[PDB]
């Protein structure tokens, strides 16, 4: 199965629950590559605080929060402003704020990520990256992530699978 | 994939969230049957209230809650006791209770059901019951709860796969 890969995750990051809640500080990659076409993957925001999603490069410092202040990484973060390079590339509206409780789904196609929450696309894409990428997560702040990479709470988005 | 049944719901059942999640008022069963030897799901207690987690026949009254009144289910209530016949057939220890935000994973190898919470085996058995059975869980006053039938936050135990 898919899940939070213990061997790519920052040094103060708790993986727990067969791979699937992510606590702590730091981040962790997802145990495989978005090798395919049209990716779909989700995390349940168990607990809010310091927290994003997105892909990176297995280069990323998994250290580092938040994510997306360089090359490695394209993250939502926890205020729904998307960074890559350390530059804002979109940003979810303030009426659209990520809450305690929701289901964020990520879609990837290597031209772009684009956000959905609770289902809903937000239509904030941001363009893809260069190099071989995995989905990412961090957390800090109490955060809890738990992550769907099979079992979703929101049919894919047509066109998107689950990562095999 | 394995899901909540909108063809074997109770009348005032609501099934959202990909056919995961259970809210409202009574039973539903999942859209397999326990055809193999050993067998393991997961719910998690989103919301407690009233609500039950088991096995029951196509014959079981999805509207006639609390299940285990009858032959037709077997299931550990929000009590932790475990019911058939209407018959109490185990309980689990009164400082184990299950709580909002558990997860309750259920064995089944049809000689009996077998209850953990949060990955721990609580070693309350109750025997198995006649016919062919499927997953079931019914909610009431307030409860929501939601299905793992293959992503599991728990490793299934020695020998128990999920539902193919």
């Known amino acids: ?31 495989a590559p978005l090798h395919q076409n049209k990716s779909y993957f989700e995390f349940k925001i168990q607990s809010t605080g310091i927290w994003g999603i997105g892909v990176a490069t297995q280069k990323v410092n998994l250290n580092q929060i938040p994510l997306g202040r360089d090359m ?3 993250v939502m973060r926890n205020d729904g402003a998307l960074y890559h390079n350390n530059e804002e590339k979109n940003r979810l509206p303030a009426n659209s704020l990520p809450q305690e409780g929701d289901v964020v789904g990520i879609t990837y196609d290597h031209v772009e990520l684009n956000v959905y929450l609770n289902g809903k696309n937000m239509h904030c894409p941001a363009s893809g990256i260069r190099g071989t990428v995995y989905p990412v997560v961090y957390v800090d702040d109490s ?22």
């Open 1 to 31: 199965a898919v899940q939070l890969d213990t061997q790519h995750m920052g040094t103060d990051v708790v993986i727990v629950k067969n791979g699937r809640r992510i606590c702590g500080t730091g981040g962790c990659l997802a145990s």
């Open 143 to 164: 955060a809890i992530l738990d992550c769907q990479f099979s079992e979703f709470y929101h049919t894919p988005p047509p066109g998107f699978e689950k990562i095999l």
């Open 72 to 74: 490695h990484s394209l």
